Coordinates of C-alpha atoms in Angstrom, one line a residue:
Chain A
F534 CA -0.2 -0.3 0.2
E535 CA 1.7 3.2 -1.1
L536 CA 1.0 6.4 0.0
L537 CA 3.1 9.3 -1.6
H538 CA 2.2 12.9 -2.1
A539 CA -0.7 12.7 -4.0
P540 CA -4.3 12.1 -3.6
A541 CA -5.1 8.8 -2.1
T542 CA -7.5 7.4 -4.8
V543 CA -7.6 3.7 -3.7
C544 CA -10.0 3.6 -0.4
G545 CA -12.6 1.0 1.0
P546 CA -14.6 3.3 3.4
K547 CA -18.8 3.4 2.6
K548 CA -21.9 4.0 4.8
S549 CA -25.6 3.3 4.0
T550 CA -27.5 4.0 6.8
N551 CA -31.5 4.2 6.4
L552 CA -32.9 7.5 6.3
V553 CA -35.7 8.7 8.5
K554 CA -37.7 11.7 7.5
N555 CA -39.7 14.8 10.1
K556 CA -37.7 13.2 13.1
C557 CA -34.8 14.8 15.0
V558 CA -32.4 12.8 14.5
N559 CA -27.7 12.7 13.9
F560 CA -27.3 12.9 10.2
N561 CA -23.7 12.5 8.4
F562 CA -24.3 13.3 4.6
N563 CA -20.6 12.5 2.8
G564 CA -18.8 14.2 5.7
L565 CA -21.0 16.5 6.5
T566 CA -22.0 16.0 10.0
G567 CA -25.1 17.7 11.9
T568 CA -27.8 17.1 14.0
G569 CA -31.9 17.8 12.9
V570 CA -35.0 17.0 11.3
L571 CA -34.7 16.0 7.5
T572 CA -37.9 17.0 5.4
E573 CA -38.7 17.0 1.8
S574 CA -38.0 20.2 0.0
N575 CA -38.5 22.5 -3.0
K576 CA -35.4 23.9 -3.3
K577 CA -34.0 23.6 -7.4
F578 CA -30.4 22.7 -6.6
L579 CA -28.5 22.9 -9.3
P580 CA -26.5 19.4 -10.3
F581 CA -23.0 20.2 -9.3
Chain B
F205 CA -18.4 33.8 -34.2
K206 CA -21.3 32.0 -32.9
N207 CA -20.1 30.0 -29.7
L208 CA -18.0 31.3 -26.7
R209 CA -16.1 28.2 -24.7
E210 CA -15.2 29.5 -21.1
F211 CA -12.5 26.9 -19.2
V212 CA -10.7 27.6 -15.8
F213 CA -7.8 25.7 -15.1
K214 CA -6.5 25.2 -11.8
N215 CA -4.2 22.8 -9.8
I216 CA -4.3 22.6 -6.2
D217 CA -3.1 20.0 -3.5
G218 CA -2.7 17.9 -6.2
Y219 CA -6.2 18.0 -7.4
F220 CA -6.9 19.7 -10.7
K221 CA -10.0 21.4 -11.9
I222 CA -11.6 22.3 -14.9
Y223 CA -14.6 24.8 -14.8
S224 CA -16.6 25.1 -18.1
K225 CA -18.8 27.5 -19.7
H226 CA -21.0 27.4 -23.5
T227 CA -22.0 30.9 -24.1
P228 CA -23.3 31.5 -28.1
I229 CA -22.5 35.1 -28.9
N230 CA -22.0 37.0 -32.4
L231 CA -19.0 38.8 -32.2
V232 CA -15.8 39.8 -34.3
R233 CA -13.0 39.7 -31.9
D234 CA -12.3 40.0 -28.1
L235 CA -14.6 38.6 -25.0
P236 CA -18.2 39.8 -24.6
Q237 CA -19.3 42.2 -22.1
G238 CA -21.7 39.2 -20.6
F239 CA -21.0 38.1 -17.1
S240 CA -21.0 34.4 -16.6
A241 CA -19.9 31.9 -13.8
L242 CA -18.2 29.0 -14.9
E243 CA -19.7 25.9 -13.7
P244 CA -17.1 23.2 -12.0
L245 CA -16.8 20.4 -14.8
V246 CA -14.1 18.1 -14.2
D247 CA -12.2 17.5 -11.0
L248 CA -9.5 15.2 -11.0
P249 CA -6.8 14.1 -8.1
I250 CA -3.9 14.4 -10.8
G251 CA -1.1 14.7 -7.8
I252 CA 1.4 16.0 -10.0
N253 CA 2.6 20.0 -10.3
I254 CA 1.6 21.7 -13.4
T255 CA 4.3 24.6 -14.2
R256 CA 3.8 24.8 -18.2
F257 CA 0.9 24.9 -20.5
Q258 CA 0.3 24.2 -24.2
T259 CA -3.2 24.4 -25.9
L260 CA -4.0 21.6 -28.3
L261 CA -5.1 23.0 -32.3
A262 CA -6.7 21.2 -35.1
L263 CA -4.8 21.7 -38.0
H264 CA -6.8 22.4 -41.4
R265 CA -4.8 20.7 -44.0
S266 CA -4.5 22.3 -47.3
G276 CA 1.3 22.7 -45.3
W277 CA -1.0 23.4 -42.8
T278 CA -3.7 26.7 -42.4
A279 CA -5.3 26.6 -39.3
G280 CA -8.9 28.0 -38.5
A281 CA -9.5 31.6 -37.9
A282 CA -10.2 31.6 -34.0
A283 CA -9.4 33.8 -31.1
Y284 CA -7.9 31.6 -28.0
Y285 CA -7.6 34.0 -25.0
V286 CA -5.2 33.3 -21.8
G287 CA -5.8 35.1 -18.7
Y288 CA -3.5 34.4 -15.3
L289 CA -5.1 33.7 -12.0
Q290 CA -4.2 35.8 -9.4
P291 CA -5.1 35.7 -5.6
Chain C
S50 CA -10.8 40.7 -20.0
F51 CA -14.2 42.6 -19.1
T52 CA -16.2 40.5 -16.4
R53 CA -15.2 37.2 -17.4
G54 CA -13.0 34.6 -15.4
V55 CA -15.3 34.3 -12.5
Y56 CA -16.4 30.5 -11.5
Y57 CA -18.1 29.2 -8.9
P58 CA -15.9 29.0 -5.9
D59 CA -17.2 25.8 -4.2
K60 CA -20.1 23.2 -4.4
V61 CA -21.8 25.4 -1.8
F62 CA -25.3 26.6 -2.9
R63 CA -26.3 30.2 -2.0
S64 CA -29.8 31.7 -2.4
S65 CA -30.1 35.3 -2.9
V66 CA -27.0 36.1 -0.9
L67 CA -24.0 38.2 -1.5
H68 CA -21.0 36.2 -0.6
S69 CA -17.4 37.0 -0.1
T70 CA -14.3 35.0 -0.9
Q71 CA -10.6 34.9 -1.7
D72 CA -9.7 32.6 -4.1
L73 CA -7.7 32.3 -7.3
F74 CA -9.5 35.0 -9.6
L75 CA -9.2 36.6 -13.2
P76 CA -8.5 40.3 -12.0
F77 CA -11.7 42.3 -13.7
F78 CA -10.7 44.4 -16.6
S79 CA -7.3 42.9 -16.8
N80 CA -5.0 42.6 -19.8
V81 CA -5.6 38.9 -21.4
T82 CA -2.6 37.4 -23.8
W83 CA -5.1 36.5 -27.1
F84 CA -3.5 34.5 -29.7
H85 CA -5.1 33.7 -33.6
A86 CA -4.8 30.0 -34.4
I87 CA -4.9 31.1 -38.2
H88 CA -1.0 32.5 -39.5
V89 CA -0.9 34.6 -42.4

Protein backbone atom coordinates (compact mmCIF):
# COMPACT_ATOMS: atom_id res chain seq x y z
CA PHE A 1 0.00 0.00 0.00
CA GLU A 2 1.71 3.12 -1.26
CA LEU A 3 1.08 6.53 0.27
CA LEU A 4 2.97 9.21 -1.64
CA HIS A 5 2.38 12.95 -2.11
CA ALA A 6 -0.75 12.77 -4.30
CA PRO A 7 -4.48 12.13 -3.92
CA ALA A 8 -5.24 8.84 -2.18
CA THR A 9 -7.32 7.37 -5.00
CA VAL A 10 -7.65 3.88 -3.47
CA CYS A 11 -9.97 3.52 -0.45
CA GLY A 12 -12.35 1.08 1.26
CA PRO A 13 -14.81 3.15 3.50
CA LYS A 14 -18.63 3.52 2.81
CA LYS A 15 -21.84 4.04 4.91
CA SER A 16 -25.38 3.10 3.86
CA THR A 17 -27.76 4.07 6.75
CA ASN A 18 -31.58 4.19 6.34
CA LEU A 19 -32.87 7.79 6.12
CA VAL A 20 -35.72 8.84 8.48
CA LYS A 21 -37.83 11.95 7.75
CA ASN A 22 -39.60 14.49 10.04
CA LYS A 23 -37.60 13.18 13.04
CA CYS A 24 -34.80 14.90 15.01
CA VAL A 25 -31.80 12.71 14.06
CA ASN A 26 -27.98 12.99 13.90
CA PHE A 27 -27.10 12.96 10.17
CA ASN A 28 -23.78 12.43 8.33
CA PHE A 29 -24.03 13.25 4.59
CA ASN A 30 -20.69 12.36 2.87
CA GLY A 31 -18.65 14.13 5.60
CA LEU A 32 -21.20 16.79 6.63
CA THR A 33 -22.27 16.00 10.22
CA GLY A 34 -25.21 17.73 11.94
CA THR A 35 -28.33 17.29 14.11
CA GLY A 36 -31.89 18.13 13.04
CA VAL A 37 -34.99 16.96 11.14
CA LEU A 38 -34.83 16.03 7.44
CA THR A 39 -37.81 17.10 5.29
CA GLU A 40 -38.69 16.94 1.57
CA SER A 41 -37.84 20.37 0.10
CA ASN A 42 -38.76 22.29 -3.08
CA LYS A 43 -35.25 23.82 -3.36
CA LYS A 44 -34.01 23.63 -6.98
CA PHE A 45 -30.37 22.61 -6.43
CA LEU A 46 -28.06 22.96 -9.44
CA PRO A 47 -26.51 19.59 -10.47
CA PHE A 48 -23.02 20.35 -9.01
CA PHE B 1 -18.19 33.97 -34.26
CA LYS B 2 -21.30 32.08 -33.05
CA ASN B 3 -20.12 30.26 -29.87
CA LEU B 4 -17.90 31.01 -26.84
CA ARG B 5 -16.01 28.43 -24.75
CA GLU B 6 -14.86 29.48 -21.25
CA PHE B 7 -12.56 27.25 -19.17
CA VAL B 8 -10.73 27.72 -15.85
CA PHE B 9 -7.83 25.33 -15.16
CA LYS B 10 -6.38 25.25 -11.62
CA ASN B 11 -4.10 22.82 -9.74
CA ILE B 12 -4.25 22.84 -5.91
CA ASP B 13 -3.12 20.14 -3.37
CA GLY B 14 -2.75 17.58 -6.22
CA TYR B 15 -6.33 18.11 -7.49
CA PHE B 16 -6.75 19.64 -10.97
CA LYS B 17 -10.03 21.50 -11.59
CA ILE B 18 -11.64 22.39 -14.95
CA TYR B 19 -14.55 24.88 -14.87
CA SER B 20 -16.45 25.12 -18.18
CA LYS B 21 -19.11 27.32 -19.78
CA HIS B 22 -20.69 27.50 -23.27
CA THR B 23 -22.16 30.86 -24.35
CA PRO B 24 -23.31 31.43 -27.97
CA ILE B 25 -22.33 35.02 -28.91
CA ASN B 26 -22.03 36.90 -32.23
CA LEU B 27 -18.85 39.04 -32.11
CA VAL B 28 -15.98 39.78 -34.55
CA ARG B 29 -13.25 39.45 -31.88
CA ASP B 30 -12.42 39.79 -28.14
CA LEU B 31 -14.47 38.64 -25.12
CA PRO B 32 -18.14 39.73 -24.94
CA GLN B 33 -19.20 42.17 -22.17
CA GLY B 34 -21.38 39.53 -20.47
CA PHE B 35 -21.12 38.01 -16.98
CA SER B 36 -21.05 34.19 -16.85
CA ALA B 37 -20.13 32.07 -13.79
CA LEU B 38 -18.13 28.96 -14.78
CA GLU B 39 -19.67 25.76 -13.35
CA PRO B 40 -17.00 23.20 -12.29
CA LEU B 41 -17.16 20.41 -14.92
CA VAL B 42 -14.15 18.16 -14.08
CA ASP B 43 -12.30 17.58 -10.78
CA LEU B 44 -9.47 15.02 -10.96
CA PRO B 45 -6.92 13.96 -8.28
CA ILE B 46 -3.88 14.19 -10.63
CA GLY B 47 -1.23 14.74 -7.91
CA ILE B 48 1.53 16.28 -10.11
CA ASN B 49 2.76 19.91 -10.30
CA ILE B 50 1.81 22.00 -13.37
CA THR B 51 4.28 24.81 -14.26
CA ARG B 52 3.80 24.94 -18.07
CA PHE B 53 0.60 24.98 -20.17
CA GLN B 54 0.23 24.31 -23.93
CA THR B 55 -3.01 24.30 -25.99
CA LEU B 56 -3.73 21.74 -28.76
CA LEU B 57 -5.02 23.03 -32.12
CA ALA B 58 -6.82 21.25 -35.00
CA LEU B 59 -4.67 21.80 -38.12
CA HIS B 60 -6.74 22.13 -41.32
CA ARG B 61 -5.00 20.47 -44.30
CA SER B 62 -4.71 22.69 -47.41
CA GLY B 63 1.25 22.49 -45.53
CA TRP B 64 -1.01 23.51 -42.62
CA THR B 65 -3.49 26.43 -42.42
CA ALA B 66 -5.20 26.70 -39.01
CA GLY B 67 -8.82 27.91 -38.80
CA ALA B 68 -9.61 31.55 -37.99
CA ALA B 69 -10.19 31.50 -34.20
CA ALA B 70 -9.19 33.44 -31.08
CA TYR B 71 -7.88 31.72 -27.92
CA TYR B 72 -7.43 33.93 -24.82
CA VAL B 73 -5.20 33.18 -21.80
CA GLY B 74 -5.71 35.02 -18.49
CA TYR B 75 -3.60 34.19 -15.41
CA LEU B 76 -5.49 33.68 -12.12
CA GLN B 77 -4.28 35.83 -9.20
CA PRO B 78 -5.09 35.61 -5.45
CA SER C 1 -10.91 40.62 -19.74
CA PHE C 2 -14.01 42.74 -18.88
CA THR C 3 -16.01 40.83 -16.21
CA ARG C 4 -15.06 37.23 -17.22
CA GLY C 5 -13.09 34.53 -15.34
CA VAL C 6 -15.55 34.26 -12.42
CA TYR C 7 -16.25 30.61 -11.49
CA TYR C 8 -18.24 29.03 -8.66
CA PRO C 9 -15.77 29.00 -5.71
CA ASP C 10 -17.21 25.71 -4.32
CA LYS C 11 -20.11 23.22 -4.50
CA VAL C 12 -21.84 25.27 -1.73
CA PHE C 13 -25.29 26.50 -2.86
CA ARG C 14 -26.33 30.05 -1.89
CA SER C 15 -29.69 31.71 -2.73
CA SER C 16 -30.16 35.53 -3.01
CA VAL C 17 -27.08 36.23 -0.81
CA LEU C 18 -23.83 38.16 -1.43
CA HIS C 19 -20.77 36.01 -0.56
CA SER C 20 -17.18 37.32 -0.28
CA THR C 21 -14.35 34.80 -0.82
CA GLN C 22 -10.59 35.03 -1.51
CA ASP C 23 -9.56 32.51 -4.21
CA LEU C 24 -7.46 32.43 -7.40
CA PHE C 25 -9.57 34.59 -9.75
CA LEU C 26 -8.99 36.46 -13.02
CA PRO C 27 -8.96 40.20 -12.14
CA PHE C 28 -11.76 42.27 -13.72
CA PHE C 29 -10.84 44.28 -16.87
CA SER C 30 -7.31 42.78 -16.73
CA ASN C 31 -5.09 42.40 -19.82
CA VAL C 32 -5.56 38.86 -21.26
CA THR C 33 -3.10 37.50 -23.86
CA TRP C 34 -5.11 36.54 -26.97
CA PHE C 35 -3.77 34.59 -29.98
CA HIS C 36 -5.16 33.76 -33.46
CA ALA C 37 -4.91 30.09 -34.52
CA ILE C 38 -4.57 31.05 -38.24
CA HIS C 39 -1.19 32.39 -39.46
CA VAL C 40 -1.10 34.69 -42.54
